[PDB]
Design a protein around this ligand. Structure first.
Ligand SMILES: Nc1ncnc2c1ncn2[C@@H]1O[C@H](COP(=O)(O)OP(=O)(O)O)[C@@H](O)[C@H]1O
Ligand SMILES: Nc1ncnc2c1ncn2[C@@H]1O[C@H](COP(=O)(O)OP(=O)(O)O)[C@@H](O)[C@H]1O
Ligand SMILES: OC[C@H]1O[C@](O)(CO)[C@@H](O)[C@@H]1O
Ligand SMILES: OC[C@H]1O[C@](O)(CO)[C@@H](O)[C@@H]1O
Ligand code: BEF
Ligand code: BEF
Ligand SMILES: [Ca+2]
Ligand SMILES: [Ca+2]
Ligand code: NA
Ligand code: NA
Lengths: 306, 306
């Protein structure tokens, strides 16, 4: 069972629950992925910075509770933990307002990067690339994982408002796309990043990247899986979402859990099965408010997939 | 009825209400004072900056609902509205964690200051002095109110963590104390700012400021009122607080409401009556969670004072 490293932003998502209240929900895409993997009995570890504040300590506690290795989660001395307000009438990027800019995670330093080993995974989202020093630190982490013979997963997970220089987003994100073994886009993100109007055109636009595995999520319709000379839609049972927050991260968690335990993750059968798990995780994640709340264990996932 | 201008930070206070929820409560000391005055049928107006975000719009809506003039509440183009997490096991400064530093209000500019007129009041708290440009803008506003023949009220309302240079707090706050007609301290703040161990010693330490009216709040014991050659404790009925958040601002609101409608606020009878109102407001404010929730109207206050 290969270790999956997650890095980036652990955040508190404030999610409406009644007209005058927010639920205090643990979140942050790479933290969500870490917990998704752990819930499936995988080996996940998180490195990054939160703030020395109650929200940062709450995220440390959450990762601890969830059996995610968080020895390399540090408290920044000055900056605050990311705090995000969710609007449930919107979906994805449009649903979030980032109250802390730049939050502690944006100050990831080179010395925060842990030792990597051959065969490990590193998963990254674009918020880690939004501002310096995290951007350069995260690119260094990617280069180090590649050098040691590990694998790199990237989910742009675009949140434009976090970028102090939003005009840098497209190029910076595409630089990371070019480094990854696995890239997951939503349909909308693929089109945005490539300036195209369809998935077909978006996939053609990234062909010269020779990305080993691209997955494009299609909401209730599942996911398009693109590997060399092959495209295939993989879909499971559609559900009516209660909260879509983090469904994409649950998806990545199932995907990477299955790739991480595979003898040879490049194998087409392994990939398609991993995407079946991913779709089931994404569906189940939507059944409760909070990105992490309904991240399934294997008993729940197997029951749903049957 | 003289207009009272309030400036500084309008904030969203996230107040625990159940183990997994926060109440979304409008707050921010000068906003609290503005609303307290308005609830008592006074003429209050707020100038300052919040963020172009849901919390900033919520604070605009709150001031609007409360009949506080907020024509001069602006949305900063870049910075976020102050967001504060409250710990109900603590009191005052120790109960707050500021998640947004620097928030929008810290970017108050000289051009944000509205036109003042003779006999108006301006009330300020120390967060407005914490960082530039708000610090210099607020000192300019104070100088302008003094020049036109208005009156200046200052409540340090210390929140050290908001200062990027906390070593500047003492001197900067005492500079404002030297400009004010009315200064309200908690017992703890007076001692901290003067480096003393008693109210008596603290009052002696500020004697050469020749401050026309100093009020030192004493929690359930009421307030010490210090005017030239006179000190007097004014107390009302003690209550068991449900939430002390903003009790001090309710106090200031009652005080300034009564001074603002007085023919001659310097009159000793007027001052002592204003403090009686202040104590009643402070007590009643504690009866519900949220700084603004239980700010009384006159019917409630009169009933309580009887
Ligand atoms: N209505 C749905 N029914 C079943 N699965 C869904 C549904 N919506 C999303 N999913 C699953 O979640 C994945 C990602 O969708 P998405 O909502 O974009 O994630 P997120 O909201 O976290 O950004 C899909 O590929 C799919 O597996
Ligand atoms: N337990 C209490 N009973 C009655 N009045 C109180 C009580 N606590 C506070 N007050 C009133 O509120 C005023 C300020 O107290 P304080 O709690 O320090 O305000 P804040 O919590 O907003 O900083 C007192 O001067 C008094 O008028
Ligand atoms: O993917 C969902 C997650 O992404 C974020 O917007 C940024 O990391 C979080 O607020 C949320 O939990
Ligand atoms: O005085 C109470 C108020 O002071 C603040 O801490 C800062 O303005 C707010 O969080 C609260 O409403
Ligand atoms: F970005 Be998804 F909501 F995880
Ligand atoms: F600072 Be007090 F709680 F208004
Ligand atoms: Ca996503
Ligand atoms: Ca106070
Ligand atoms: Na959920
Ligand atoms: Na209250």
């Amino acid at each position: 069972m290969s270790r999956v490293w997650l890095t980036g932003d652990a955040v508190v998502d404030l999610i409406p629950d009644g007209q005058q209240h927010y639920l205090k929900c643990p979140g942050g895409a790479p933290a969500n992925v870490a917990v998704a993997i752990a819930r499936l009995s995988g080996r996940s570890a998180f490195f990054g910075r939160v703030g020395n504040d109650p929200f940062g300590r709450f995220m440390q506690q959450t990762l601890t509770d969830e059996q995610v290795d968080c020895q390399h989660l540090h408290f920044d001395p000055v900056h605050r933990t990311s705090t995000v307000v969710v609007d449930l009438d919107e979906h994805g990027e449009r649903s979030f307002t980032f109250m802390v800019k730049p939050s502690a995670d944006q100050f990831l330093q080179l010395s925060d990067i842990p030792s990597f080993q051959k065969g490990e995974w590193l998963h990254v989202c674009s918020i880690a690339l939004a501002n310096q020093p995290s951007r350069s630190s995260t690119f260094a982490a990617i280069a180090q994982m590649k050098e040691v013979g590990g694998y790199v997963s990237f989910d742009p997970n675009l949140r434009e408002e976090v970028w102090s220089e939003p005009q840098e987003l497209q190029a910076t994100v595409m630089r990371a796309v070019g480094l990854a073994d696995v890239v997951k886009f939503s349909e909308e993100e693929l089109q945005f990043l490539t300036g195209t109007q369809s998935i077909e055109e978006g996939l053609q636009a990234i062909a010269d990247f020779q990305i080993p595995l691209v997955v494009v999520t299609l909401g209730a319709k599942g996911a398009l899986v693109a590997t060399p000379n092959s495209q295939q839609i993989v879909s499971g049972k559609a559900v009516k979402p209660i909260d879509t927050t983090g469904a994409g991260d649950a998806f990545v968690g199932g995907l990477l859990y299955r790739l991480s335990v595979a003898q040879d993750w490049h194998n087409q059968a392994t990939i398609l099965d991993a995407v079946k798990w991913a779709n089931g995780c994404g569906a189940l994640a939507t059944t409760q408010k909070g990105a992490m709340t309904a991240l399934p264990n294997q008993a729940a996932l197997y029951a749903f997939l049957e």
